[PDB]
Amino acid sequence: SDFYLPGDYLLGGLFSLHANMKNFLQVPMCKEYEVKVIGYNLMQAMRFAVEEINNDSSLLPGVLLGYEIVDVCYISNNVQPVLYFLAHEDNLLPIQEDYSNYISRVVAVIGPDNSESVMTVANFLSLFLLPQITYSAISDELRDKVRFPALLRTTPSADHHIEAMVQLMLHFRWNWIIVLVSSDTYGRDNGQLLGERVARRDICIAFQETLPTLQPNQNMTSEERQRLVTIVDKLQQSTARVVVVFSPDLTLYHFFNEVLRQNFTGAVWIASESWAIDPVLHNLTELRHLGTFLGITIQSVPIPGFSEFREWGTCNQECDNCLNATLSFNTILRLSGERVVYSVYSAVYAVAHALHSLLGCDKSTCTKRVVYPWQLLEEIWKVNFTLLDHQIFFDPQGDVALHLEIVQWQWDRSQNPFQSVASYYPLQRQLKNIQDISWHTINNTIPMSMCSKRCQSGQKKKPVGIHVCCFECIDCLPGTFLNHTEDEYECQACPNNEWSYQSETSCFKRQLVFLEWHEAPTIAVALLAALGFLSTLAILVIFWRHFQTPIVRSAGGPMCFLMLTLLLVAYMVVPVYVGPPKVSTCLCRQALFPLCFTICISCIAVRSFQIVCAFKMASRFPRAYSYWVRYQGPYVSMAFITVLKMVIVVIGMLATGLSPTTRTDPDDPKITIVSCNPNYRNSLLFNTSLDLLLSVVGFSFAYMGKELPTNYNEAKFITLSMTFYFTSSVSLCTFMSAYSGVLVTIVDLLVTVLNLLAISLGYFGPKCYMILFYPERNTPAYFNS
Amino acid sequence: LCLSQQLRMKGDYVLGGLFPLGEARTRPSSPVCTRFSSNGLLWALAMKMAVEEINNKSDLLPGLRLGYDLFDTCSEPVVAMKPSLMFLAKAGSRDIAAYCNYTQYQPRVLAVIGPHSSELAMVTGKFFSFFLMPQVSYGASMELLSARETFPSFFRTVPSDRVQLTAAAELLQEFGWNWVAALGSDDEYGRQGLSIFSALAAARGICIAHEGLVPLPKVQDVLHQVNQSSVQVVLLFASVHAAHALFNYSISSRLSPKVWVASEAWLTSDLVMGLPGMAQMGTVLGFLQRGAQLHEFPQYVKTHLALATDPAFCSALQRCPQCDCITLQNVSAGLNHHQTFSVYAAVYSVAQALHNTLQCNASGCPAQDPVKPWQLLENMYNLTFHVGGLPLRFDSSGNVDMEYDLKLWVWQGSVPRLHDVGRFNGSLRTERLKIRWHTSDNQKPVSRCSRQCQEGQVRRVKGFHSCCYDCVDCEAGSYRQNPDDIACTFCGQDEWSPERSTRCFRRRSRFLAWGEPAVLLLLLLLSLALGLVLAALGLFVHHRDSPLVQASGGPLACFGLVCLGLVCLSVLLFPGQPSPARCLAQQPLSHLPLTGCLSTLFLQAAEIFVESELPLSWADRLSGCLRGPWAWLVVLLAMLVEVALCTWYLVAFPPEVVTDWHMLPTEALVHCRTRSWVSFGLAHATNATLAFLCFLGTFLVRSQPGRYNRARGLTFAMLAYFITWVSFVPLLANVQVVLRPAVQMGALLLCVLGILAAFHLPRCYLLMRQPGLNTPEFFL
Ligand SMILES: *[C@@H]1O[C@H](CO)[C@@H](O)[C@H](O)[C@H]1NC(C)=O
Ligand SMILES: *[C@@H]1O[C@H](CO)[C@@H](O)[C@H](O)[C@H]1NC(C)=O
Ligand SMILES: *[C@@H]1O[C@H](CO)[C@@H](O)[C@H](O)[C@H]1NC(C)=O
Ligand SMILES: *[C@@H]1O[C@H](CO)[C@@H](O)[C@H](O)[C@H]1NC(C)=O
Ligand SMILES: *[C@@H]1O[C@H](CO)[C@@H](O)[C@H](O)[C@H]1NC(C)=O
């Protein structure tokens, strides 16, 4: 038959012609199972490769190359063919400690197409070091040469498949995926490898689930139906829209059927090499509404003169229905190209080149020396040639970097069923040359598969769970921003007393608002205080121009002159209120204004007392009146009140501090008013409390004798001025209790100026009136009346 | 010593053997292991003792000799494949044929006692299955070796990982921990255990928060992932070295204590058990095997070593060249190893299967053709073999069944000991009363996830397999828009939402309604004030020619009473729904009449002050002009300036009816608000100056005892106005925003009542009750 061709050096093969998709005493042969077409395709590829070696006189001249292909089941039959290959021509395999002198029947073996059988065959062959170039086996366990010394490969491992998947996800900006594996070892290792790889590229896995192993052509149980319903419900409820599947193609019919039944659409499925080229699933022709079906598969290399050769055409070494099965799938195989066929082609060519180099042939003659399998392995480890514009050389880890290819399923039989969209180069670990992909969206937009929306400019990122890439966006509170260069996970406030608005990434400096010389209310208050100051200066000039008069002598001469000078000083330091509040400014203000005002009010009160209530008190305590008249009662009272005010103002300075303060007004954080007392309400309340305690007794004493002429109607004018001061203080207290803002300083200054104006006018202006316009009442002879 | 010479023994049926006797390419040469291992020699001697005991017995294998070929296989499979090929070779020949199927073979060994290593057992079983050679392997544990599809002739004497993992899952479910983290070693043992436990947890409802692989001697990321989830029960299905590295790193980083469910690999290993500082790593709960022990094995080992020391027997009579040059002290540490019983029972199982296959009684065994190895398999399943008084059975999948003990570590003087606190014979039965946990008190460490979310909550999937949900409550003002939402959505900022609500409720208005108790009381006060104004007006218009009203104004007094009544009337328009016109016209309507009455009172005060504290020369001209048409022009000017100020502040300062949607908790607001202290202050300034002038000109005066004090009433009216409004302002700035209009009307009504009871009421008292003081010489 075609499974055997005698030659100088045989070349064993292992191709899965049949698979199981529906008692140990009866051994089920591979013939009873359903016929697979890929196995016969690869077998014909190997036959064509050997036949081309035979044609080529430049490669292996005068050395006929043969082969012995044995049908190997998927799992069931994997030991007998190895024993056949290693047995001698008599089917006897000797046992010895060392096998260097041993000459096997075959010189090399093309390994099985599934990883488990490859592992078993390589485990058996490790004793004799028979070169075994497996194809289409993608397990990472074959990458190490400690336990597989004589195992080579012509297909990139699952490492490069996973890398291509991750690069495809990165290119389209997907960071929230779903992994579905199978109960078999292949799915589990692929899922674990993808999970290990994807964690370092800022891509998270929403959830991983295992699809129960379920061959087709058999009815499903209730437990597996419930399991599939649960899987599909979990898939639909999650927000991820990129589903990678690591499962053999046989177990995916029921899952996709359940997905169609559940009416779930909008998933960008990513396929491993197992079912990315499976023709039956594409022929199902109802998945076109699910979404785009990407997949990872080996790049197709067009072999010249292979389609015509393929179309031209012991135990477990026969098949009958292979040709009939391949007849139906001929067109799709021709259109889709050859992907795994080139792997077998290259493996056979590598064996041929290793034999040619080992024999040392000079393209004319060959030495025809006996070749041991270990010598062939040592030679094939160091082959480096070309084949269809592809370099064939083996890495130290037993792999040749064949270009991968991301393929997208296209539901149109007029062209290739699996249209290539991208190419991956394992040598540089780079995925490049990406073409347009027909997406399933409304207007061909790349589907979005991100768990968390991008945060708005100036929004703190708060982790929501275990997954790093998922977060929630919460606005930073007023007064802070985000320094994206430093960290975006926590707001960083702006120092230097500057405030920020909501969702604002640039702190702005607060403007320092304060009393300034060129404004309207300050100019009005300055004009009022100037009018008062010139009025009081004129009063003082008049008083010094008119002395030795009953008006100024019955009244306290030194007392009134001192009060006038203190009012002059207070008016002259009034503009110290305006301007930049410094330590000296507040020191002078609080050591001058309250002192002067308090001593003026104390003088007024003691004068009212001595003019009204002294006469009445003269009746009860006579010796007290003698003490009062012998000394200078009003002067000692004024001194005592002055020292008490000194004590209280010193305690106020020691309590509330001296440094000018910055208070953030509720109207506009952007502004910051500066007063000099950090605690101003309590200080003003204390000052007004002492002043009003003195004022109530002063005004009561003035009222008690308001009709007595005394010192030219002193009680009446004291009463008028003191009631004016009381009303002004009440107005200030109420306005303070019902307002707090920028106008506090100007209102306080206005009230102080008005109080000084009251004390000046309503107590001295009558005196100026009588002195100037009434020159008859100031004569000494009028003292009698 | 020549101990290795005893590794063979001729007999009618000879058993194979693959033991780890020794320990650790270009040419195809089998590697040679020269290092010596005590465990392998102990197991080989156990098998030899079992074979000798079977030969000794007369009721088992009667008149038949059972042999053994104990071959040394290292942990590597390359060195182990050669003994297997020797086993499958024809007896007396060194060549193994490559036949079509198993039936044509004539193997030299009846059965094989499989390798201890399960990774080696994989290759050995897959090789033997083609020839259907019955191999029973001690120590091979992981589950996929039980698959009859690829291992039709692989049995074992130790339980699979499936039963112990089922026991662990049942323990976690029974103790309530359905939110656990699963870890495993990077070798095949850990991966298979992780897959099996994943299946069992999915079946039992348990949730795996993080499934990860601790690398063999990275770990930091695994610990970080475990700590990220709030998990207090961690199943570590790892080998000894991986567990030791894990616990050493956890000691270095001071990881918080957790309940470590231990696999049998490191549950009883002294390396992990004796780690310094390990006591602070929570409780360790494992499932140790419950198997009998050979009570005479050490005696046999000592006696056989001594008998081998004698040269007479040794001369009277390689696989382990290093096994000859040993002493007793080189093996004394491993006599009490529980795999010796497994080897013993495996040999007994093969012997009993052979006895059943030959079908013979205790007296003898009939002669027949030699039995092929593949004929044992028909009787090795369904096989009941008694080993040391305890019966064992081979399941349909070659699995033996035995009980388990839940052992937990305790700590006293850094001495960890194992106590049985449970038993697993297919159904877990724990005694948790005696269990001492690691927490502050003796309480079970809780580790539970919410399988379902309570109604009205948002659900966030959590776990490596989306097993449970995290219920999160969000603060008021938010609602769950749809059940599948991952975050509750806000509603329209004009509607309120209660805490933990499926939907929001609309915000309805709440202003000062006509039915509120405060408005009712203020309405009664307004009624009383208006009645007083009407009575005073009636008295002032009936006794209009009397000296009382003539001195106290005249037409002007009645005009002021009308104005006070109109102020009381304008009080009415504050409450109710804030129409823009009403809220705009609140204040001007309040001050327009009050301005008129205050100006009339000020005219009276000015007349009194002019007649009192001025020279007669100016008085004779001021008094005759301040009463009459000039007084009317003065009151008209006051009203006109009030009108001008009111219209200017109405066109410039906007009184707005704003709807503060975010003031009341469950309701909106309709606040009629104007400029802060600017609008009403400016409208109030004219009245303030008018009242202050009246008070200043009236409050001090000479009241002769023979006349009438016409200043007391005006002084007290101004005082009532001032004190009531000075008290009103803080109430304006302090009372709740709803009752602000009520405060305003209360202030206006109190001002009117004070003015009345101070000025008009004392006049009316003597105008109505005691008309004996109405003489012109007393008033004018
Ligand atoms: C060359 O190979 C072809 C098929 O590739 C085969 O049919 C033919 O016999 C070979 N020899 C020659 C001389 O063409
Ligand atoms: C089971 O298999 C039979 C035979 O192929 C098939 O007819 C049937 O639909 C399947 N399902 C059930 C539920 O019987
Ligand atoms: C869509 O979904 C519904 C609801 O699950 C399902 O019954 C139906 O078969 C699906 N397909 C169509 C075409 O309606
Ligand atoms: C191709 O797809 C069709 C349409 O569903 C299907 O019937 C057929 O079995 C598939 N396979 C072929 C023609 O080989
Ligand atoms: C292929 O099928 C046809 C009928 O369609 C049959 O005549 C022929 O023998 C088959 N060929 C095989 C089984 O090789």
Ligand SMILES: *[C@@H]1O[C@H](CO)[C@@H](O)[C@H](O)[C@H]1NC(C)=O
């Ligand atoms: C194989 O040969 C090519 C062509 O000279 C060279 O570029 C390449 O580096 C070689 N590869 C190795 C592995 O030596």
Ligand SMILES: *[C@@H]1O[C@H](CO)[C@@H](O)[C@H](O)[C@H]1NC(C)=O
């Ligand atoms: C796709 O095309 C239509 C027609 O030009 C355009 O109006 C529409 O916005 C596009 N779709 C999307 C989702 O942007």
Ligand SMILES: *[C@@H]1O[C@H](CO)[C@@H](O)[C@H](O)[C@H]1NC(C)=O
């Ligand atoms: C923000 O980060 C930059 C870059 O490190 C640094 O220079 C700067 O001081 C930080 N703060 C602000 C307020 O920009």
Ligand SMILES: *[C@@H]1O[C@H](CO)[C@@H](O)[C@H](O)[C@H]1NC(C)=O
């Ligand atoms: C077998 O029996 C003999 C006596 O017949 C005894 O000496 C020997 O120890 C026994 N073997 C054992 C117990 O392994």
Ligand SMILES: *[C@@H]1O[C@H](CO)[C@@H](O)[C@H](O)[C@H]1NC(C)=O
């Ligand atoms: C084994 O193969 C031979 C080949 O001659 C066959 O006759 C025999 O029936 C086979 N035995 C089985 C399948 O059990």
Ligand SMILES: *[C@@H]1O[C@H](CO)[C@@H](O)[C@H](O)[C@H]1NC(C)=O
């Ligand atoms: C335990 O961990 C520490 C910290 O990493 C390390 O230094 C030490 O060598 C480790 N111990 C062992 C026995 O490996």
Ligand SMILES: *[C@@H]1O[C@H](CO)[C@@H](O)[C@H](O)[C@H]1NC(C)=O
């Ligand atoms: C573990 O997580 C807790 C809780 O977030 C944290 O405080 C602690 O630093 C983490 N690390 C360790 C080693 O405990």
Ligand SMILES: *[C@@H]1O[C@H](CO)[C@@H](O)[C@H](O)[C@H]1NC(C)=O
């Ligand atoms: C016996 O033990 C000694 C002491 O540990 C050791 O040196 C010697 O190698 C051992 N003999 C062996 C392993 O054969």
Ligand SMILES: *[C@@H]1O[C@H](CO)[C@@H](O)[C@H](O)[C@H]1NC(C)=O
């Ligand atoms: C049991 O079998 C033996 C061997 O054939 C035979 O000699 C004997 O008679 C049988 N019966 C009894 C009761 O031992």
Ligand SMILES: *[C@@H]1O[C@H](CO)[C@@H](O)[C@H](O)[C@H]1NC(C)=O
């Ligand atoms: C043997 O196994 C079969 C399986 O069908 C069972 O019916 C029978 O009871 C078993 N015999 C035993 C356990 O002795």
Ligand SMILES: *[C@@H]1O[C@H](CO)[C@@H](O)[C@H](O)[C@H]1NC(C)=O
């Ligand atoms: C397991 O043991 C319990 C008692 O601990 C017993 O009730 C139960 O029947 C046993 N189960 C089996 C399968 O033997």
